[PDB]
Amino acid sequence: PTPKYTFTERAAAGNLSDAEILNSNNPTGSELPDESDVVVGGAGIHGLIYALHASKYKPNNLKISVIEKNTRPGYKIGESTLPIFYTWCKLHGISAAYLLRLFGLKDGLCFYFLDRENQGQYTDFCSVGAPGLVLASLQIERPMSELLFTILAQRNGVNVYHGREVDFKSTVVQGGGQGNKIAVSRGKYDSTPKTIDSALFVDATGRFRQFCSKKAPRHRFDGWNCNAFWGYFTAPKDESKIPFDLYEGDHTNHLCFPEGWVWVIRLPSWEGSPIANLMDMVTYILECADAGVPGDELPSSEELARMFGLKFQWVTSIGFAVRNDVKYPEDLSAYGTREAEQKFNYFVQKYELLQQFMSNFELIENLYGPGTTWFIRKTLAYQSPVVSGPGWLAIGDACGFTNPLYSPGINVGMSTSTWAAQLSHPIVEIGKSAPADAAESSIRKLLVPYDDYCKSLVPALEQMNRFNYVCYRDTRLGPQVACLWQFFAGIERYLSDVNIETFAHYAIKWVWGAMVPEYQQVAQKCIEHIETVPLDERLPDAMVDELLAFSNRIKSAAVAADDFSLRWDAILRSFDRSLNFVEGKTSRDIYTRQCSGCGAWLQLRPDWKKCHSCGLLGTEPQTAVTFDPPLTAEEEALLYAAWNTAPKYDPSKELKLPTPTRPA
Ligand SMILES: Cc1cc2nc3c(=O)[nH]c(=O)nc-3n(C[C@H](O)[C@H](O)[C@H](O)COP(=O)(O)OP(=O)(O)OC[C@H]3O[C@@H](n4cnc5c(N)ncnc54)[C@H](O)[C@@H]3O)c2cc1C
Ligand SMILES: CC1(C)c2[nH]c3cc(Cl)ccc3c2C[C@@]23CN4CCC[C@]4(C[C@@H]12)C(=O)N3
Ligand SMILES: CC1(C)c2[nH]c3cc(Cl)ccc3c2C[C@@]23CN4CCC[C@]4(C[C@@H]12)C(=O)N3
Ligand SMILES: [Cl-]
Ligand SMILES: [Zn+2]
């Protein structure tokens, strides 16, 4: 396909604002409709996942309008995504060759555990992702992901309106099929708001809980909560001076210690690009995905920036997520002038490994506009007690949130977004087909499992977060108990069988494995012991011995009961096939390489000879996926064949769950 510059030229011809050029791509028009079936407040990632999944699950059934306050897709923290997210993108028609032009490659998770009392000592836990012919994970700049899903939504019959705000003071939400009146303005100052008459309102306003807060007070869990502070840094081409052995920038890297952990995420940034030019680039990429353009014939990221007049750079997202019972010095003025900067730099100099690590990175000033060099957010975890009611439901962060760790926010949270999307079709039809009293009663009963799932979801994720945090207080418990159990309980068994029809049903059974009984049994034993040791103290060595022995005893039985075949010793660098810890083991599959020209991390497969980010050609390591232990040519062909195309929906087939097999 020849690239078109439709939006760039339309914007210049009409001198259109950012919101006006975006809204001009709507199928129904740039102005709000008088009526809709569903109105979604908020076009964050979940509001858009919801609208995309609802239209894809059953096309041409629901008229859906998404209302977003930002004039263009705004900055969000939350950049790391997991295989279930990519699978969802692939099911919606965008595979890795196209996504990697916009987003950074993610190949597994790596954890480094720093000893607080023995500075310089550390251990690690490293895993790999998948071959390029299997799947990819992504590090996403959120202004780009929300733009991608906006354009994709607009191309699938969904209207998205930026620069428009739901007025929750005058909005009326009623049950049955009686009808909502959603008031939409451009802000407080706008005294000519519009009304959308509609059947279902979806609260996707994130942590702001703009609608469901009216129905219940925000709920907090017992015990300590977490604070976060972060910033953006350069992304070094040469990672060889990082003070951790075998470090690789294309993981989501975690620097873990008693007080909390640091995330390190390498990703490309498009900041500075005009919004109209970005729409043209994204539209071109989708036209290429529609036509099936092969990766080596698709322009590279930097070539796209030249074609469409964009700005492109590599950055590292680095942030702390620490417990809010940490004692800080009263005066931190020596480390900066703002609290976020002060606490970031104070914590770095508390660990020599963190300071040696950070000395590979240069701070970026105001990457996302003035005042964005430093970010801080306090008291992260919460839950919404009420997530549905007459005429409305909530999804995503509006239901609750725990912690960045293991990225449940996007990847687990999309279970609610996609289930609500599926449920939205019968919800709307019930109201159009039955009198008001019975309609409301039938909708209420239909949503009882959705309410019950949300109610138990956040507490389970909260226990999962505390489980990892307490084990991060020791360099043996971290990798050998917490990491091991999250990977065994949470690896996505039978993901290659998921399709659009089963996606929500599968996703709600995942929960990162946090509902697995043996997982909860080990987590409760560790939490119960470690929470009795004050944070400023080292864990007694006998406590670590006992928790380790208890964990390994429960592990051996649960691993023997799992009937899912997996080359565990190839995926986890430090463990054998039976998930036994091996002290000196370093062997692992090799799925990626770093481009010598631009530093971008690449997936190895024989049909991607050039760097997808800068276009530089490689010389035969792409065919050099290293399987260790090796696979025959037939086993390798069989692996790739399983992941080629998702199977058609077979209503006779029973859904296979991602969690380990029950012991029976
Ligand atoms: C420090 C930190 C790190 C994190 N890291 C990760 C990670 O690595 N991976 C991960 O998966 N998750 C991560 N998360 C969680 C993740 O950021 C959230 O789960 C995710 O952004 C939730 O998306 P959402 O669409 O529900 O809400 P948001 O993305 O917050 O979107 C809400 C939208 O609603 C709009 N809005 C608000 N009020 C109105 C109104 N009245 N009218 C119209 N629109 C309105 C806002 O403009 C906004 O765009 C992290 C969270 C934190 C705090
Ligand atoms: C199941 C997947 C998505 C997975 N999910 C993880 C979660 C954590 Cl926490 C760590 C590692 C993984 C992996 C690595 C896997 C293991 N599978 C072997 C056959 C195909 C596949 C898919 C992929 C593969 O090639 N790599
Ligand atoms: C398990 C059930 C109760 C179920 N549980 C869900 C949870 C969510 Cl979140 C979404 C959908 C479902 C469904 C619909 C199912 C899926 N199964 C396919 C084989 C038999 C069965 C049973 C039934 C079926 O025919 N329909
Ligand atoms: Cl992650
Ligand atoms: Zn390159």
mmCIF file of all heavy atoms in Angstrom, residues 419 422 504-505 508-509 651-655, ligand 3:
data_model
loop_
_atom_site.group_PDB
_atom_site.id
_atom_site.type_symbol
_atom_site.label_atom_id
_atom_site.label_comp_id
_atom_site.label_asym_id
_atom_site.label_seq_id
_atom_site.Cartn_x
_atom_site.Cartn_y
_atom_site.Cartn_z
ATOM 1 N N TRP A 419 -14.906 -9.096 29.510
ATOM 2 C CA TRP A 419 -16.134 -9.753 29.948
ATOM 3 C C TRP A 419 -17.315 -8.789 29.906
ATOM 4 O O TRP A 419 -18.404 -9.150 29.444
ATOM 5 C CB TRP A 419 -15.958 -10.332 31.355
ATOM 6 C CG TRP A 419 -17.025 -11.332 31.727
ATOM 7 C CD1 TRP A 419 -17.948 -11.901 30.888
ATOM 8 C CD2 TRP A 419 -17.274 -11.882 33.028
ATOM 9 N NE1 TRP A 419 -18.751 -12.773 31.589
ATOM 10 C CE2 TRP A 419 -18.364 -12.774 32.904
ATOM 11 C CE3 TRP A 419 -16.686 -11.704 34.288
ATOM 12 C CZ2 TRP A 419 -18.871 -13.495 33.990
ATOM 13 C CZ3 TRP A 419 -17.192 -12.418 35.368
ATOM 14 C CH2 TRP A 419 -18.276 -13.303 35.210
ATOM 15 N N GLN A 422 -18.540 -8.460 26.358
ATOM 16 C CA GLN A 422 -19.379 -9.570 25.929
ATOM 17 C C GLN A 422 -20.769 -9.476 26.549
ATOM 18 O O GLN A 422 -21.777 -9.654 25.855
ATOM 19 C CB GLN A 422 -18.683 -10.884 26.288
ATOM 20 C CG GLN A 422 -19.431 -12.137 25.934
ATOM 21 C CD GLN A 422 -18.591 -13.388 26.149
ATOM 22 O OE1 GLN A 422 -17.363 -13.322 26.248
ATOM 23 N NE2 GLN A 422 -19.253 -14.535 26.219
ATOM 24 N N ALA A 504 -12.633 -13.747 27.015
ATOM 25 C CA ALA A 504 -13.041 -13.285 28.342
ATOM 26 C C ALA A 504 -13.147 -14.443 29.333
ATOM 27 O O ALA A 504 -12.696 -14.332 30.479
ATOM 28 C CB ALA A 504 -14.370 -12.534 28.254
ATOM 29 N N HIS A 505 -13.737 -15.562 28.905
ATOM 30 C CA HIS A 505 -13.872 -16.727 29.780
ATOM 31 C C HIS A 505 -12.506 -17.238 30.229
ATOM 32 O O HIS A 505 -12.307 -17.564 31.407
ATOM 33 C CB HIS A 505 -14.664 -17.820 29.048
ATOM 34 C CG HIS A 505 -15.012 -19.008 29.892
ATOM 35 N ND1 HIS A 505 -14.668 -19.113 31.224
ATOM 36 C CD2 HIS A 505 -15.674 -20.150 29.585
ATOM 37 C CE1 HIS A 505 -15.101 -20.267 31.700
ATOM 38 N NE2 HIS A 505 -15.717 -20.914 30.727
ATOM 39 N N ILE A 508 -10.705 -14.477 32.743
ATOM 40 C CA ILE A 508 -11.182 -14.424 34.120
ATOM 41 C C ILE A 508 -10.759 -15.640 34.931
ATOM 42 O O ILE A 508 -10.869 -15.615 36.160
ATOM 43 C CB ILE A 508 -12.717 -14.268 34.191
ATOM 44 C CG1 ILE A 508 -13.420 -15.517 33.671
ATOM 45 C CG2 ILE A 508 -13.174 -13.023 33.424
ATOM 46 C CD1 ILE A 508 -14.642 -15.886 34.476
ATOM 47 N N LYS A 509 -10.270 -16.698 34.282
ATOM 48 C CA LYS A 509 -9.737 -17.860 34.983
ATOM 49 C C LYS A 509 -8.233 -17.777 35.217
ATOM 50 O O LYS A 509 -7.662 -18.683 35.837
ATOM 51 C CB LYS A 509 -10.060 -19.142 34.208
ATOM 52 C CG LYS A 509 -11.547 -19.420 34.070
ATOM 53 C CD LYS A 509 -12.194 -19.717 35.412
ATOM 54 C CE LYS A 509 -13.667 -20.081 35.227
ATOM 55 N NZ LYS A 509 -14.245 -20.751 36.422
ATOM 56 N N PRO A 651 -18.049 -24.464 19.583
ATOM 57 C CA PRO A 651 -18.878 -24.501 20.800
ATOM 58 C C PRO A 651 -18.982 -25.878 21.433
ATOM 59 O O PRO A 651 -19.466 -25.978 22.568
ATOM 60 C CB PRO A 651 -20.244 -24.010 20.308
ATOM 61 C CG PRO A 651 -20.260 -24.347 18.855
ATOM 62 C CD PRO A 651 -18.845 -24.187 18.375
ATOM 63 N N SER A 652 -18.552 -26.935 20.742
ATOM 64 C CA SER A 652 -18.500 -28.265 21.334
ATOM 65 C C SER A 652 -17.272 -28.463 22.213
ATOM 66 O O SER A 652 -17.291 -29.321 23.102
ATOM 67 C CB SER A 652 -18.514 -29.331 20.236
ATOM 68 O OG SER A 652 -19.474 -29.027 19.238
ATOM 69 N N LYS A 653 -16.214 -27.689 21.986
ATOM 70 C CA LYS A 653 -14.968 -27.856 22.718
ATOM 71 C C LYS A 653 -15.037 -27.162 24.073
ATOM 72 O O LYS A 653 -15.536 -26.039 24.189
ATOM 73 C CB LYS A 653 -13.800 -27.301 21.902
ATOM 74 C CG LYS A 653 -12.447 -27.464 22.560
ATOM 75 C CD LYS A 653 -11.355 -26.856 21.702
ATOM 76 C CE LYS A 653 -9.981 -27.111 22.296
ATOM 77 N NZ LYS A 653 -8.915 -26.407 21.528
ATOM 78 N N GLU A 654 -14.535 -27.839 25.101
ATOM 79 C CA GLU A 654 -14.483 -27.267 26.437
ATOM 80 C C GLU A 654 -13.217 -26.440 26.600
ATOM 81 O O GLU A 654 -12.150 -26.803 26.095
ATOM 82 C CB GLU A 654 -14.543 -28.358 27.507
ATOM 83 C CG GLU A 654 -15.921 -28.988 27.651
ATOM 84 C CD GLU A 654 -16.017 -29.934 28.834
ATOM 85 O OE1 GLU A 654 -15.098 -29.922 29.682
ATOM 86 O OE2 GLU A 654 -17.010 -30.691 28.913
ATOM 87 N N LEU A 655 -13.351 -25.318 27.302
ATOM 88 C CA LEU A 655 -12.235 -24.405 27.491
ATOM 89 C C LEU A 655 -11.213 -25.002 28.452
ATOM 90 O O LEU A 655 -11.554 -25.409 29.567
ATOM 91 C CB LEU A 655 -12.742 -23.067 28.024
ATOM 92 C CG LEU A 655 -11.691 -21.970 28.163
ATOM 93 C CD1 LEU A 655 -11.179 -21.593 26.797
ATOM 94 C CD2 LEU A 655 -12.273 -20.762 28.864
HETATM 95 C C1 LIG B 3 -18.960 -23.102 31.753
HETATM 96 C C2 LIG B 3 -20.162 -22.260 31.297
HETATM 97 C C3 LIG B 3 -21.218 -22.315 32.411
HETATM 98 C C4 LIG B 3 -19.676 -20.834 31.151
HETATM 99 N N1 LIG B 3 -18.972 -20.135 32.106
HETATM 100 C C5 LIG B 3 -18.648 -18.890 31.591
HETATM 101 C C6 LIG B 3 -17.932 -17.838 32.146
HETATM 102 C C7 LIG B 3 -17.735 -16.711 31.371
HETATM 103 CL CL1 LIG B 3 -16.826 -15.383 32.037
HETATM 104 C C8 LIG B 3 -18.230 -16.608 30.084
HETATM 105 C C9 LIG B 3 -18.950 -17.662 29.545
HETATM 106 C C10 LIG B 3 -19.171 -18.817 30.286
HETATM 107 C C11 LIG B 3 -19.832 -20.065 30.034
HETATM 108 C C12 LIG B 3 -20.588 -20.511 28.821
HETATM 109 C C13 LIG B 3 -20.353 -22.015 28.630
HETATM 110 C C14 LIG B 3 -18.939 -22.415 28.190
HETATM 111 N N2 LIG B 3 -18.879 -23.875 28.092
HETATM 112 C C15 LIG B 3 -18.458 -24.442 26.806
HETATM 113 C C16 LIG B 3 -18.702 -25.931 26.966
HETATM 114 C C17 LIG B 3 -19.895 -26.022 27.915
HETATM 115 C C18 LIG B 3 -20.175 -24.558 28.297
HETATM 116 C C19 LIG B 3 -20.625 -24.295 29.749
HETATM 117 C C20 LIG B 3 -20.756 -22.773 29.945
HETATM 118 C C21 LIG B 3 -21.193 -23.867 27.390
HETATM 119 O O1 LIG B 3 -21.883 -24.451 26.567
HETATM 120 N N3 LIG B 3 -21.250 -22.545 27.594
#
